Design a protein around this ligand. Structure first.
Ligand code: CL7
Ligand code: CL7
Ligand code: CL7
Ligand code: CL7
Ligand code: CL7
Ligand code: CL7
Ligand SMILES: C=Cc1c(C)c2cc3nc(c4c5[nH]c(cc6nc(cc1[nH]2)C(C)=C6CC)c(C)c5C(=O)[C@@H]4C(=O)OC)[C@@H](CCC(=O)OC/C=C(\C)CCC[C@H](C)CCC[C@H](C)CCCC(C)C)[C@@H]3C
Ligand SMILES: C=Cc1c(C)c2cc3nc(c4c5[nH]c(cc6nc(cc1[nH]2)C(C)=C6CC)c(C)c5C(=O)[C@@H]4C(=O)OC)[C@@H](CCC(=O)OC/C=C(\C)CCC[C@H](C)CCC[C@H](C)CCCC(C)C)[C@@H]3C
Ligand SMILES: CC1=C(C/C=C(\C)CCC[C@H](C)CCC[C@H](C)CCCC(C)C)C(=O)c2ccccc2C1=O
Ligand SMILES: CC1=C(C/C=C(\C)CCC[C@H](C)CCC[C@H](C)CCCC(C)C)C(=O)c2ccccc2C1=O
Ligand code: SF4
Lengths: 29, 658, 30, 685
């Protein structure tokens, strides 16, 4: 019921907090 | 070696202690080298955005997985026979037998049944398609992106909040009460009225048609003028089926009371009313709105907030099974047991955490001069008294409860159950959603009473004696966590305040264990119709061992047999994993550092003297874990074991029953 | 993207765990 | 001197028997020790009198002796006061009493005692033996302390204790056997009533054979074979005792033999060991307890496989109770052996005496030994327990074909299987010749049936048996690792070079060097006791489940046995879930359902043992610190009320906390298993 377009967009969005987590982590170190 | 950057004491440790103590102290920002209170609060501030981003990506995962891999649609169609699904299993290690067995709840491939009442919660709050969930998920990833972006921006000196913004705690308290709690409460009533209740009454509200839709026909006219009457419209008929037009009312705010019969849950209208009321009260109190110490110490603040979240999550557990607010969750027994046990164990963790940071406060932050005759000063003034009283009520409640249970065991064993000391819970009868409190319930309540007493006995003897005692007058010197003062004065093992948190975690687990044991046995009895079994057998301890533990284990431990696997295989296995983990805790709790340090010396010898192997060597001289790390790893094993074993058992006990 | 499990799981557990353990190793040994 | 702190009371009880501490001279010490040994022998004589007395006075002995298959031994009647009457069981023929499992009755029948007069005579005989042994101790200590020279006379003492006791005791007993026991048992098998059999005062291939296997009537070994065996040993021991040198020019001097034995590898060899053995009690207690323990363990295996006494095989309750009792005594003694080896190494070890002898060479390569034991323990750990884990994962993953089992991947214990074929098929005319049959059916046998019950049968060996054997090897090596490490590092380590000085028991050398908790030899015995418990727990479980799944049972219509657990060992003992389900869960049904029955007491002790065990975690998991802090708050509450005691109340020593932790852990765990075994085998077997 969930289409591949949607699965990909979800991943691409999730990539954003990933980068920002790397950034915040670096900061807090 | 560089790591840990923050602690040079450790960074110059030539041993493996440097890596362990690093990881152990990596979040005690206070103790970092050259940490000024200003930077401390700023660092803390940014970390919190990290935590919240995690909680949101966690929630995001829930929604993403249930959307993609769940059976949420099929379940909304048949919410009483369809087992709701948590996520797919991809595991290259499963045999065909186990893939077949985990292929359940009409899923193509192997899945994990959900037992967090997430399906129920989402159905209740209006989500009806995988799209609603997928959007929730992508939304929540973006929220987390924003929260991460925020922590980054904040720690950037551009928007780095100075000590001012944190010294303004009073403002933060009022803001929390109103701007956060009140505002979000009525915002949530917004959601309820606009989406939850409609979708409950069979009317689809999307983000694109709720602007179009009005919750109440009489809505605008009632708003600001005669709001109470119009809002209390035709109440939803008992006939009403959740998510259908059939028997759908129109009332958005009510005080109907009791439970919707189809879903056996609190009326959405009653919840919306509740939240509106809560919002009004909170906002009003906000407008309307130990001081020294609380503002001074962040430990005092967390401690207070942990004790707070402690009681809150306890009541959440107590209320969320008695007063189900989610559709069909009352009928889903495994989920309700799971959630109760979950929230009660988290309750006990937050509670003991309160007393932990209590003791940290008393060894890092409490200045006796600063507060001349405060509550805390008076508390310490007669420690020996507070402790002697808690001691007494512990020995009293204990001796008598154990004595009575043992008396009952003995006489019942001797085949004279008549002679049992069955005490009726009269006050429980007086007060009494509420289930029959018999003499079993009485004895267990007193068990729990006693255990909660001994827990607070311990985790206050801790936070009071933290400053010192006759055995060690100056503990504040050595701090919260330290091994001992040596074998000096008859011996001082486990004299630290941290040691009291350690000794009290055991009691916290015993206490919550008695709580959730009682919960789950009572409920399994009722959910099998043999409430008689609980009532008759709960009065002697063999009844708990034979009927609760022995009796409800059978399904679980047959999860995998030589004959074959069933769906409970993974739980049988987790059950054992938890026994192993628990017991492994005994390795570290019982065997103490010196044995190991000698052994590891010999292994260092063998390595250095073995050809081919000697070519590589440690950078960090291997050493046995520290005294305290032994206690900590012991306790984490014991705890993790305890939780995992019981979680397995809760699931495996309830799942076959349903 | 039915297969995304069979890619994401080894990637995260084996490759990511490996890379994480390698990185943490460098981190605590440098 | 004075009792100032509560610790004094504890210390009193602790070091009361530490003669080494209380005294300075081997003379006064050896006197105390000899006197005590007498005291102790009297305690055992009292106890033996008690057993034969209870068998006489409060027993179904005579009924049993009449019809063993029918009756169940019960020499233990309980006074009815609080409704404990129920513990008295219907053991048959209307006798109501606690079904005893000691096998006393089998002992007496084997001794050929059929007369109530005879049994009372035996009781009073043993009781006067007690009355004289305690007085003998008093005489030899107070009246007439013995001489140091006598003690150090190990060659005399050997010759004596080996002919006077072993050779002569075996001849004496073979007399008592062939004359009293053997013909009485023959008559009782022929069916002569107990009353009909004559009293003792009234009074070579026929009575001495090499039949092997079991008497198919009694189920025991042919008492002909017993007589011949004991005679054989009498012969052997008479000779062997003649092979030493006491107060004459004839024999081998031990010191000569010892010092002779050196070699390339062992440097100066045994030179100095005679000296330490003679001068050090602890060295003797070490060697002895180690061999005594090892003996109890051989006892356990031998008595189940070659059930000596008549009808014992059929009595599954005794066969189990005796295997398990002897295993416990074995493990406990082996560990006390290690203990006293460590106490020796700390106290009674002189570098002067031991100089490049085998003992010094041990201490000099003690890291290679600990390191290698460490390795073999990790290895065995993984390749025993890890094979069970493997199987738990494979079976739970529904990949039974990937498991270690008789099916799928197979670990056949071929060495053992081979020895088994070599003992079953090799009956006669190999090495020691003219053996009519196998020493036991365990090697290879079709089930011998005494009544419905299988007396003894081929104890098979498959993957389950390879696995559990490696589990035993693993746990014994870990226990050796802990114990040999506590011995060889009792004097010193890289961590604490002055451990000898810190003592045998000391809680630690304080928190430095990373922490030195439990670094003493005593602390090694502490940890060794938990591993001996884990080891013997699993040996007793291996016995119980293998016996009751593969050996014991009932003969039905068909030749086939109705095994107690129906052969689930082969497939269920190869996973931990197997053990949890098909052993502890499945088989605890008797003990948990024992309330309001004969076996209710086993139910209560199952619970109470669970409680004592959990309670010991209070001691093992916590430290003296917390307790002394709390104790002093409680004292403040007695001070307020002017109840504060004269003897200041002190939290127990660090070492005492550990010792009681361990005591309660052991008592709880052992009693728990005991309850479970008894309930299951009294009810089912
Ligand atoms: C036990 C493992 C662990 C956990 C679960 C954990 N930390 Mg720490 N932890 C932090 C906070 C924190 C938060 C907000 C948080 C979750 O609530 C955690 N942690 C959680 C920051 C203060 C700090 C920054 C972390 C930081 O550098 O994280 C990098 C960001 C990540 C991995 C990228 C994630 C996206 C992957 C594409 C941190 C530290 C650090 C460590 C270590 C070892 C830890 N941790 C340990 C952990 C650093 O040294 C490291 C350190 O340098 O401390 C001096
Ligand atoms: C892209 C959106 C996404 C999110 C938000 C998400 N997952 Mg999944 N994810 C899993 C857990 C999970 C958790 C615990 C979790 C909660 O944060 C999430 N996920 C969340 C396991 C069920 C399974 C494991 C394989 C594996 O993990 O898949 C890769 C998952 C990724 C790309 C999502 C990464 C995003 C998470 C937000 C990161 C969370 C970080 C955390 C907050 C920081 C603290 C660390 C902590 C340890 C202290 C999995 C799957 C999987 C996928 C995919 C595509 C995803 N996911 C996707 C997501 C598998 O194929 C695959 C699946 O199909 O399996 C059949
Ligand atoms: C009185 C109950 C109620 C509450 C608490 C409430 N709305 Mg509505 N509400 C809206 C948003 C909103 C927000 C942001 C919000 C925040 O709390 C709320 N509401 C809250 C807008 C779509 C719109 C203005 C509004 C409506 C509307 C109505 C009505 C009757 C309501 N409501 C009702 C409510 C319009 O007809 C009308 C439709
Ligand atoms: C459990 C009770 C407890 C709670 C709930 C709690 N703390 Mg403390 N707490 C902190 C903050 C804090 C925050 C922000 C917080 C939020 O609510 C809490 N705490 C809460 C920091 C001030 C400070 C920093 C702590 C510290 O620096 O944190 C770093 C420690 C880390 C990275 C390792 C933690 C590893 C986990 C233990 C084990 C997880 C097991 C896992 C599930 C795997 C299972 C496998 C699988 C089968 C599932 C801290 C203290 C400390 C303690 C103690 C005992 C506590 N706490 C206790 C608690 C210190 O001594 C210690 C201290 O330094 O005192 C002097
Ligand atoms: C050879 C087997 C044997 C042994 C070992 C043995 N007896 Mg007899 N034996 C006696 C005692 C005795 C003692 C005290 C003793 C051990 O010390 C033994 N025996 C031992 C006396 C009752 C009696 C003289 C005697 C005899 C007798 C016999 C016979 C055949 C035996 N035995 C047999 C044995 C007389 O005829 C005759 C019967
Ligand atoms: C547990 C293994 C062990 C064994 C089998 C063993 N010892 Mg030692 N042992 C001695 C001799 C000895 C003898 C003669 C002997 C004979 O078999 C043994 N031992 C055996 C003494 C020389 C010497 C002192 C003896 C001395 O301390 O013993 C006095 C008696 C004591 C305190 C009572 C202990 C009570 C038990 C805890 C409870 C057991 C009872 C029963 C199970 C049922 C429970 C009762 C019920 C009410 C619940 C000794 C040492 C000592 C130790 C230790 C650890 C041991 N041992 C250990 C053992 C010293 O510290 C200690 C020492 O101080 O080091 C030198
Ligand atoms: C079965 C498990 C178990 C029991 C029974 C137990 C027992 C108790 N723990 C106490 C405390 C604690 N326990 C602590 C840590 C732990 N305790 C643990 C496990 C237990 N602890 C574990 C695993 C830990 C982590 C180390 C701490 C840190 C404390 C306390 O401060 C607290 C305390 O001391 O409070 C003052 C007491 C709490 C009840 C009380 O005050 O008096 C009630 C007494 C009870 C319920 C047991 C009594 C047993 C019986 C009645 C005694 C008589 C039995 C026989 C007649 C005795 C004679 C036997 C001879 C004949 C052989 C009590 C002594
Ligand atoms: C379940 C409880 C428990 C476990 C598992 C345990 C484990 C062990 N104890 C050992 C020793 C000891 N234990 C001691 C005191 C105690 N030990 C206790 C309880 C335990 N001790 C308790 C309660 C005490 C207090 C008395 C002492 C005093 C010693 C030793 O000297 C001895 C030792 O160190 O010898 C060297 C080791 C035996 C040698 C070995 O390495 O075997 C191999 C490891 C085993 C059997 C544990 C599980 C291994 C399984 C197969 C997992 C395989 C690994 C997988 C790949 C999992 C990895 C997962 C990651 C990828 C995340 C081993 C680490
Ligand atoms: C078993 C045991 C040990 C020995 C256990 C040790 C030393 C831990 C063993 C090492 C574990 C297996 C992990 C270390 C190796 C990992 C491979 C490290 C990976 C992380 C690196 C990047 C740092 C103790 O040190 C000890 C100390 C105090 C009380 C009880 C005990 C105790 O019970
Ligand atoms: C509980 C506990 C204690 C406290 C336990 C004590 C002090 C036991 C001693 C008290 C008992 C009750 C002995 C009996 C005292 C007198 C005999 C009282 C008279 C009793 C009459 C009524 C008969 C420790 O001292 C300790 C030390 C080291 C590690 C762990 C622990 C530990 O766990
Ligand atoms: S923690 Fe270890 S070192 Fe410290 S007092 Fe206790 S036993 Fe001694």
């Amino acid at each position: 019921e969930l289409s591949d377009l949607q699965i990909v967009i979800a991943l691409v969005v999730a990539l954003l907090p990933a980068l920002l987590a790397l950034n915040l982590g670096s900061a807090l170190s | 070696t560089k790591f840990p950057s923050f602690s040079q004491d450790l960074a110059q440790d030539p041993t493996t202690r440097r890596i362990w103590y690093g990881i152990a102290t990596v979040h005690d920002f206070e103790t970092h080298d050259g940490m000024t209170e200003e930077n401390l609060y700023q660092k803390i501030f940014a970390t919190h955005f990290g935590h919240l981003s995690i909680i949101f990506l966690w929630s995001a995962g829930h929604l993403f997985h249930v959307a993609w891999q769940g059976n949420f649609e099929q379940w909304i169609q048949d919410p009483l026979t369809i087992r709701p699904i948590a996520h797919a299993i991809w595991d290259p290690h499963l045999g065909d037998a186990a893939t077949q067995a985990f292929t359940q709840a009409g899923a193509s491939g192997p899945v994990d049944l959900c037992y967090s009442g997430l399906y129920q919660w989402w159905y209740t709050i209006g989500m009806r398609t995988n799209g609603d969930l997928y959007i929730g998920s992508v939304f929540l990833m973006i929220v987390a992106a924003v929260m991460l972006f925020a922590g980054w921006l904040h720690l950037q000196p551009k928007f780095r909040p100075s000590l001012a913004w944190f010294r303004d705690a009073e403002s933060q308290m009022n803001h929390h009460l109103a701007v956060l709690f009140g505002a979000s409460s009525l915002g949530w009533t917004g959601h309820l009225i606009h989406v939850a209740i409609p979708e409950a009454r069979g009317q689809h509200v999307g983000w694109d048609n709720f602007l179009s839709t009005m919750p109440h026909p009489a809505g605008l006219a009632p708003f600001f003028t005669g709001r109470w009457g119009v809002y209390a419209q035709n109440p939803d008929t008992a006939g009403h089926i959740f998510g259908t037009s059939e028997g759908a009312g129109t009332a958005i705010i009510t005080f109907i009371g009791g439970f919707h019969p189809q879903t056996e849950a609190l009326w959405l209208t009653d919840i919306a009313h509740h939240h509106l009321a809560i919002a009004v009260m909170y906002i009003i109190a906000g407008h309307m709105y130990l001081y020294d110490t609380y503002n001074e110490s962040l430990h005092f603040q967390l401690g207070f907030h942990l004790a707070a979240l402690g009681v809150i999550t306890s009541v959440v557990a107590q209320h969320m099974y008695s007063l189900p607010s989610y559709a069909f969750i009352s009928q889903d027994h495994v989920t309700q047991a799971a959630l109760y046990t979950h929230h009660q164990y988290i309750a006990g963790i937050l509670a003991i955490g309160a007393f932990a940071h209590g003791g940290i406060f008393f060894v890092r932050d409490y200045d006796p001069e600063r507060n001349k005759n405060n509550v805390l000063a008076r508390a310490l003034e007669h420690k020996e008294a507070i402790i002697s009283h808690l001691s007494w009520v512990s020995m009293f409640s204990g001796f008598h409860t154990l004595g009575v249970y043992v008396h009952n065991d003995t006489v019942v064993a001797f085949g004279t159950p008549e002679k049992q000391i069955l005490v009726e819970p009269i006050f429980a009868q007086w007060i009494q959603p509420f289930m029959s409190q018999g003499p079993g319930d009485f004895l267990v309540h007193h068990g729990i009473a006693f255990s909660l007493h001994v827990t607070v006995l311990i985790c206050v003897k801790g936070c009071l004696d933290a400053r010192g005692s006759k055995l060690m007058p100056d503990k504040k010197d050595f701090g919260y966590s330290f091994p001992c003062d040596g074998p000096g004065r008859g011996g001082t093992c486990d004299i630290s305040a941290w040691d009291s948190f350690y000794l009290a975690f055991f009691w916290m687990l015993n206490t919550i264990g008695w709580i959730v044991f009682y919960f789950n046995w009572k409920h399994l009895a009722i959910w099998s119709g043999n409430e008689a079994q609980f009532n008759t057998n709960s009065t002697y301890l063999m009844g708990w061992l034979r009927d609760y533990l022995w009796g409800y284990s059978a399904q679980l431990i047959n999860g995998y047999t030589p004959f074959g696997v069933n769906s409970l295989s993974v739980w049988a296995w987790i059950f054992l994993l938890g026994h192993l983990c628990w017991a492994t805790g005994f390795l570290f709790l019982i065997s103490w550092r010196g044995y190991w340090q000698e052994l590891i010396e010999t292994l260092v010898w063998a390595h250095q003297r073995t050809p081919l192997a000697n070519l590589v060597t440690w950078k960090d001289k291997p050493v046995a874990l520290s005294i305290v790390q032994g206690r900590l790893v012991g306790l984490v094993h014991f705890a993790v074991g305890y939780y995992v074993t019981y979680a397995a058992f809760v699931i495996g006990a309830t799942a076959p029953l349903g | 993207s039915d297969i995304l499990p069979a890619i994401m799981t080894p990637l995260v557990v084996l490759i990511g765990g490996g890379a994480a353990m390698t990185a943490f190793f460098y981190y605590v040994e440098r | 001197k004075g009792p100032q702190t509560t610790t004094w009371i504890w210390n009193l009880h602790a070091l009361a028997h530490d003669f080494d501490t209380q005294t300075n001279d081997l003379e006064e010490i050896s006197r105390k020790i000899f006197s005590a040994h007498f005291g102790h022998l009297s305690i055992i004589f009292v106890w033996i009198s008690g057993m034969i007395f209870h068998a006489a006075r409060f027993s179904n002995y005579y009924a049993w002796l009449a019809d063993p298959l029918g009756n169940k031994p019960s020499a233990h009647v309980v006074w009815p006061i609080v409704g404990q009457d129920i513990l008295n069981a219907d053991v048959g023929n209307g006798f109501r009493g606690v079904q005893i499992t000691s096998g006393l009755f089998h002992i007496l029948r084997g001794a050929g005692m059929t007369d109530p007069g005879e049994l009372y005579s035996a009781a009073i005989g043993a009781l006067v033996a007690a009355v004289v042994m305690m007085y003998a101790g008093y005489y030899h200590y107070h009246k007439k302390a013995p001489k140091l020279e006598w003690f150090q006379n190990a060659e005399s003492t050997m010759t004596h204790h080996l002919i006077v006791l072993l050779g002569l005791g075996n001849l004496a007993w073979t007399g008592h056997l062939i004359h009293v026991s053997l013909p009485v048992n023959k008559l009782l098998d022929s069916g002569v009533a107990p009353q009909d059999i004559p009293i003792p005062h009234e009074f070579y291939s026929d009575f001495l054979t090499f039949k092997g296997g079991l008497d198919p009537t009694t189920g025991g070994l042919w008492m002909t074979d017993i007589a011949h065996h004991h005679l054989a040993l009498a012969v052997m021991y008479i000779i062997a005792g003649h092979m030493y040198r006491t107060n004459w020019g004839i024999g081998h001097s031990m010191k000569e033999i010892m010092e002779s034995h050196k070699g390339p590898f062992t440097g100066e060899g045994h030179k100095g060991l005679y000296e330490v053995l003679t001068t050090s009690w602890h060295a003797q207690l070490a060697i002895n307890l180690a061999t005594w323990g090892s003996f109890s363990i051989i006892v356990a295996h031998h008595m189940y496989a070659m059930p000596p006494y008549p009808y014992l095989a059929t009595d599954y309750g005794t066969q189990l109770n005796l295997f398990v009792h002897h295993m416990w005594i074995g493990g406990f003694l082996i560990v006390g052996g290690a203990a006293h080896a460590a106490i020796f190494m700390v106290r009674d070890y002189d570098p002067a005496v031991n100089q490049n002898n085998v003992l010094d060479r041990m201490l000099r390569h003690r890291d290679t030994i600990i390191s290698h034991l460490n390795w073999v323990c990790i290895f065995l750990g993984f390749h025993s327990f890890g094979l069970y884990i493997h199987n738990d994962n494979m079976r739970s993953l529904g990949r039974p074909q990937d498991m270690f089992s008789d099916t799928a991947i197979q670990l056949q214990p071929i060495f053992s299987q081979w020895v088994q074929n070599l003992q079953a098929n090799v009956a006669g005319t190999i090495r020691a010749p003219l053996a009519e049959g196998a020493s036991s059916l365990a090697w290879g046998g079709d089930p011998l049936f005494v009544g419905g019950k299988v007396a003894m049968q081929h104890v098979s060996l498959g993957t389950a048996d390879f696995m559990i054997h490696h589990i035993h090897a693993f746990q014994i090596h870990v226990t050796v690792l802990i114990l040999i490490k506590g011995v060889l590092y009792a004097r010193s380590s890289r961590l604490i070079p002055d451990k000898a000085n810190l003592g045998f028991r000391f809680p630690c050398d304080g928190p430095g060097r990373g922490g030195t908790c439990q670094s003493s030899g005593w602390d090694h015995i502490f940890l060794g006791l938990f591993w001996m418990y884990n080891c013997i727990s699993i040996v007793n479980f291996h016995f119980f489940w293998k016996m009751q799944s593969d050996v014991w049972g009932a003969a039905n219509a068909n030749g086939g046995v109705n095994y107690l657990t129906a052969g689930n060992w082969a497939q269920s003992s190869i996973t931990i879930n197997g053990w949890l389900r098909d052993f502890l869960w499945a088989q605890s049904v008797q003990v948990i359902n024992s309330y309001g029955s004969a076996l209710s007491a086993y139910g209560i002790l199952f619970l109470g043992a669970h409680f004592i065990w959990a309670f010991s975690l209070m001691f093992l998991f916590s430290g003296r610190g917390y307790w002394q802090e709390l104790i002093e708050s409680i004292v403040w509450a007695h001070s307020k009320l002017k109840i504060a005691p004269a003897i200041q109340p002190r939290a127990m020593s660090i070492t005492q906390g550990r010792a009681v932790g361990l005591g309660h852990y052991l008592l709880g765990g052992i009693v728990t298993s005991w309850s479970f075994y008894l309930a299951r085998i009294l009810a089912l077997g």
